[PDB]
Symmetry: C3
C-alpha cells in the first residue's frame, strides 16, 4: 500500500510524479531541485541558493511524510557542475547536522530546468 | 531472500545483472533501455521510440515480478540529452496513467549502447 | 532506527556521509570510489584498478554491515567514460560472481575527485 506525500511547502508535483511515496515504512523522495513552491521558480541563480532550497525542499517533503532529516537512510546528490561539490557539500552538511546518511554523488550532463543541483533520498518513518 | 525476475518480454539479462530482484516485499528493477526484445535492438533511434519501449519494458518486468506500474514507488529517469525532458515526461506519464511515483530525472553524459534514455525503479508487491 | 556502517577497511566516511546505513533489514551503501584506505588515495589511475578497488570497498561495507555481495539487490554503476563500460563490467561480474543484482549503468559528466568509476548499492541483511 502506497501513500502520496504532498507537502504544500515543497515544489508541487505537477506531472506524473509525487514529491514522495511512502511504502513498507519507508519514504522515497523524488529528486528535488531548487525551486520555490511559492514562485514555481528557482530560489536563485547560484549553487548556494539552489542547494539551500533543495535541502529545504527535501526537509519539507520528509516532514510532511512523517519522517525527518534524521531519518534519511540514503541520498543521491546530482550536480550540474562537479566544481560545485564542496559548496553544495557544506550546505548539505549544515542541512543534515549530525546525521550522516549514505550518499551517492556525481555531476550530471545537465538537470531539469537548467537546475544546478538535484537531491533525492530514501528515509524511514 | 532474493528472487530473480526474468520476463520473457523484457530485453534479456545477458550479463551480470537481473532485470529485477524481489526482496522484502519490494521489486528493484534494473535500468531499462529502449531495446525491444522482439527486434533485439533499440525500438527506434528517436527519444520518443526508446522511451515508449523503456516504459513498456519496465511494465513487463514489474508484472513479471508480481508487481505493476501502479505499485511503482520510485523511478529514476536518465537521458542522453536534457532537451528530451518534456517529450520524455509525456511518454512517461502516458505509461503510468493516474499513478504518480516518486521520481528523479537527469541527463547523463551517456548511456550504455548509445541509448537516449534509461529508466530504473523500485516498486512494491 | 538507523545503524551507521563504518568499516575500517573501506575508505573513511569523512564528512557528512556514512559508508552505508542499515535500515529496516536493508543496507543502503554510499557510492564507493576506488580509494584504497591503506594508501589514502586512488588504488590507481586506470579504470581497471579503480573498478577493482571500488568492488573491494563495497564488499567491506556490506560485510561490515552484516551483508555480502550475495545479498545485493540493486547497484548503480557510474562511469566517468561510457567506453569503460566493457572493462568495468567484467570486473563487476568477477566481484559478484554468480550473483546478479538488479543494476543501473550510466556515464556521469564527472565523479567525486576525478574518479573514473563509482558504485552504490542496496542489499539485504
Ligand atoms: Cl565476496
Amino acid at each position: 500500500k502506497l501513500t502520496v506525500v504532498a507537502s504544500p511547502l515543497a515544489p508541487e508535483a505537477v506531472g506524473a510524479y509525487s514529491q514522495a511515496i511512502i511504502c513498507n515504512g519507508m519514504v522515497y523522495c523524488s529528486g528535488q531541485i531548487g525551486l520555490d513552491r511559492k514562485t514555481g521558480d528557482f530560489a536563485g541563480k547560484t549553487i548556494e541558493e539552489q542547494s539551500k532550497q533543495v535541502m529545504t525542499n527535501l526537509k519539507y517533503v520528509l516532514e510532511e511524510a512523517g519522517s525527518s532529516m534524521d531519518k534519511v537512510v540514503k541520498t543521491t546528490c546530482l550536480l550540474a557542475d562537479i566544481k560545485d561539490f564542496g559548496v553544495f557539500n557544506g550546505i548539505y552538511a549544515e542541512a543534515f547536522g549530525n546525521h550522516k546518511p549514505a550518499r551517492a554523488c556525481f555531476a550530471a550532463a545537465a538537470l531539469p530546468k537548467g537546475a544546478l543541483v538535484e537531491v533525492e533520498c530514501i528515509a524511514t518513518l
